[PDB]
Amino acid sequence: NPNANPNANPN
Amino acid sequence: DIQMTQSPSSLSASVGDTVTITCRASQSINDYLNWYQQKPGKAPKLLIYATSSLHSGVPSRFSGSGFGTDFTLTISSLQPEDSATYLCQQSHSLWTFGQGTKVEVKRTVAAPSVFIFPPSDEQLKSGTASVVCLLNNFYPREAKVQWKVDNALQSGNSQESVTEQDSKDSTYSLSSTLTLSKADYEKHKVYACEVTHQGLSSPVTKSFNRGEC
Amino acid sequence: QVQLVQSGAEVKKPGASARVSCKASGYTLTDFYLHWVRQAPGQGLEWMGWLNPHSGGTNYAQKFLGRVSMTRDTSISTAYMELNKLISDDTAVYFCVRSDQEALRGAFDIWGQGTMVFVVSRRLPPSVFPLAPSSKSTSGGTAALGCLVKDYFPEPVTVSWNSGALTSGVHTFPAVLQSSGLYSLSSVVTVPSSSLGTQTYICNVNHKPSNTKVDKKVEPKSC
Numbered sequence: 001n002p003n004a005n006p007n008a009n010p011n
Numbered sequence: 012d013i014q015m016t017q018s019p020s021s022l023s024a025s026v027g028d029t030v031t032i033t034c035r036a037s038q039s040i041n042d043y044l045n046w047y048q049q050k051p052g053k054a055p056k057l058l059i060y061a062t063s064s065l066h067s068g069v070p071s072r073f074s075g076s077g078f079g080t081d082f083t084l085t086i087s088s089l090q091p092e093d094s095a096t097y098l099c100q101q102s103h104s105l106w107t108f109g110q111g112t113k114v115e116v117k118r119t120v121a122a123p124s125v126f127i128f129p130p131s132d133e134q135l136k137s138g139t140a141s142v143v144c145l146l147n148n149f150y151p152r153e154a155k156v157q158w159k160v161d162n163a164l165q166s167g168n169s170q171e172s173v174t175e176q177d178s179k180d181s182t183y184s185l186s187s188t189l190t191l192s193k194a195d196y197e198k199h200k201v202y203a204c205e206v207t208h209q210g211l212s213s214p215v216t217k218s219f220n221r222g223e224c
Numbered sequence: 225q226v227q228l229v230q231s232g233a234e235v236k237k238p239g240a241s242a243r244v245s246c247k248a249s250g251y252t253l254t255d256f257y258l259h260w261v262r263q264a265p266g267q268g269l270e271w272m273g274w275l276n277p278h279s280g281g282t283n284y285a286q287k288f289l290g291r292v293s294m295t296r297d298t299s300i301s302t303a304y305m306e307l308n309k310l311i312s313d314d315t316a317v318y319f320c321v322r323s324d325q326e327a328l329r330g331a332f333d334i335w336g337q338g339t340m341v342f343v344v345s346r347r348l349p350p351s352v353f354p355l356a357p358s359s360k361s362t363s364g365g366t367a368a369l370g371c372l373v374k375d376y377f378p379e380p381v382t383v384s385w386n387s388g389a390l391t392s393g394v395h396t397f398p399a400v401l402q403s404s405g406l407y408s409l410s411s412v413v414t415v416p417s418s419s420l421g422t423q424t425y426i427c428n429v430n431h432k433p434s435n436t437k438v439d440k441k442v443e444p445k446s447c
Contacts, residue, residue, distance in 0.1 A: 001039050004104040006325050010278035011255045012285075045331040054319055054338055055269070060331035098269065102323070102330025105285065106259070110268035126361035126368040126412075129445065131353040134372070143355055145368055145412050147395075172397040172409065184395045186410050188372070219360050224447035 013037050013101050015109040023115040024089050032084045032112045034099035039079040043103035046075055046084045049096045049111065051175045058097075059084065091116050094176045115152070118181035122210025123149035127203075127217040129224040130196065140196035144204035144217065146185040152176075156187040157205040157214075165189060196221070226250040228320050228336035233432055235342045241308045242341045246320035248301040251334075254278040256322045259332065260294065260305045264316040265379065274323070275303055307341070315343045315378075342378070342433050348406060349436035350376035352429050355410060356445040362417045369442050370412030371427035375404070376434075383411040384428040390415075420444050 014037035024030045034044065042062040047055035057066045059075040062082060074085040084097055096111040123146035130140040146154055152173065158165035169189045176183055187204060203218030231245040246258070260272040273284035275294040282294045288307070296303040303320060317338040323330055355361075355370035362368075373381050383396045396411040411427055429438045 001041055003041065003043055003102075003330075005043075005102060005106075005330050006257065009256055009325050010276045011252075043329055045328075047332075054321075054335035055332070056335075057328075057331055057333050061329040064328075066328075066331070066333065100269075100332070105283075106261075106271040106323075106330070106332075108261075108269040108271070124363045124366065124368075126363065128355040128361055128370070128372075129358075129447075131356065131372075134351070134353045134374075137351065141353070141372055141374065143370070143372060143410055145361070145370070145410075147368065147412075147414060170400040170402070170408070172400050174395050174397060184397075184412075186397050186412070188400075188408070188410065217360055219358075219447060224356075224358060224360070224445050 013040060013104055013107050015099055015101055015107050017099060017109040017112045019112060020110075021113040021115070023117055025117045026089055026091065028089045029085060029087045030089060030114065032097055034077070034082040034084070034109055036080045036101050040101040040103035042078055043101060044075070044077065044082045045100045045102055046073075047098045047100060049098055050178065055098060086114070089116055091118070091181045092178050094178055094181060115176055116181050118150050120210045121148060121150045121182055123147055123154060123185070123206060123208055123215075125204070125206050125215045125217050127219060129202070129219050129221070135193050138193045140191045140193050142189040142202050144187045144189075144206070146187075146206055146208075148180070148182040148184060149208060149210065150182050151209060152183050154185055154206065154208045156185070158187070158189045159201075159203045159205060160199045161201050226334055228322065228334055230320060230336040230339045233340040233342065235344055235432055235435070236310050238310055238312060238343055238345055240310050241306055242310055242314070243304065243306045244318050244320070244339045244341070246303045246305070246336055248303070253296065253301045253303065254298055256324060258296070258303045259321045259323055260318060261321055261332075262316040262318045264313065272305070277303060310343045312343050312345075314341060316341060340432070344378060344433045346377060347434040348375065348377045349431050349434040350374060350381055350429055350438065352427065352438040352440045354440055354442040355412065356442060357420055358445040358447045360447060365417055366414050367417040367420055368412055368414050369425055370410050371429065371440055371442060372408070372410045373429055374408045375402070375406045376408075376431055377406050378433050379407055381409065382430045385411070385413055386424075386426055387428055390425070
């Protein structure tokens with residue numbers, strides 16, 4: 001059930 | 012979208028008590044569950060992230076647990092400044108907030124101070140007359156205001172509003188406003204608000220005679 | 225310190241567009257996703273979407289697709305949200321808010337102060353009446369006084385006392401809905417009864433939906 005949101009910040 | 016619900020919607024507890032608030036998600040969010048505190052008129056403040064990690068500055072009184080679709084926020088040693096709404100939020104797939112749980116913090120009984128205000132001359136020029144009764148800094152929240160005009164009990168011509176609970180002293184204040192037509196107002200003499208409350212062993216009546224003010 | 229600073233309230237007709245700006249201070253805007261979240265009166269928070277301030281990429285909630293634009297000017301560390309085709313249900317407080325996708329697993333740690341957006345068609349400015357202190361509003365060294373703010377539409381009014389200098393002991397009550405469909409509230413304050421001869425007390429009532437402001441001096445009554 002992997003998350004769909006970004007795993008890293010934009011930088 | 013993932014839907015979030017909380018239970019209960021409101022609760023009341025004493026200083027030092029342990030309270031628990033549950034949060035449910037419509038589908039699993041693993042441990043991507045955050046808790047926030049919100050007070051009226053303020054932005055939310057982050058309390059807990061990743062189900063159980065305390066954000067910088069938050070006391071260990073706050074604890075979080077759960078996984079998948081069921082989560083708990085535990086507040087141990089409840090403090091007066093904890094009177095607020097507590098919100099959960101999933102951050103697994105987009106972001107969704109629960110609607111919040113309101114937490115009232117009990118304190119020792121405090122009877123209201125009672126104040127009454129006759130209508131202004133300026134309002135009488137508009138054709139209405141409002142009489143305001145203020146009940147100040149009391150606990151618990153339950154109070155009753157009865158309006159009497161020349162000793163006749165009123166019903167149907169008043170409106171009431173209560174403040175949010177004070178974060179420092181845990182009290183409430185309450186306004187009750189009796190609104191009459193000017194024509195009805197000028198036909199009566201004594202205007203009185205009669206207050207009952209746990210802190211009062213007998214009703215407190217504040218009153219004035221029309222024209223004396 | 226680390227903060228997000230938002231622009232001031234927007235008063236707009238239905239069908240118009242609302243613009244809110246959001247300035248990052250104390251951190252680099254392009255280092256974190258920037259979200260917009262709104263809260264309509266009496267309701268929970270609603271996520272609107274995010275901006276990647278580094279790339280300019282966005283992810284809008286489906287509810288707002290076609291209506292919302294999230295942009296930024298990285299040279300002045302400022303993000304922007306525009307919401308078009310406004311409807312009455314868009315009346316809300318709008319927050320910009322940073323998330324940390326790494327350390328905080330998507331949680332929202334820095335919030336702007338919020339910007340009110342009022343979608344206004346019909347409007348009626350308030351009538352402001354004094355709640356005069358008297359012997360009938362004095363109890364044990366304390367006098368209460370206030371202002372009754374009657375017959376306005378839509379919400380909200382904001383009330384200050386003595387232009388913000390008097391905040392201790394002020395209770396500005398949640399509005400009630402009158403049978404007319406107009407709103408009413410009172411704002412009250414407790415002060416020392418000894419102060420009634422030397423201090424002046426003026427309530428400042430702002431009704432941004434009608435672009436009106438009323439100041440009312442509250443003087444004692446002789447009972």
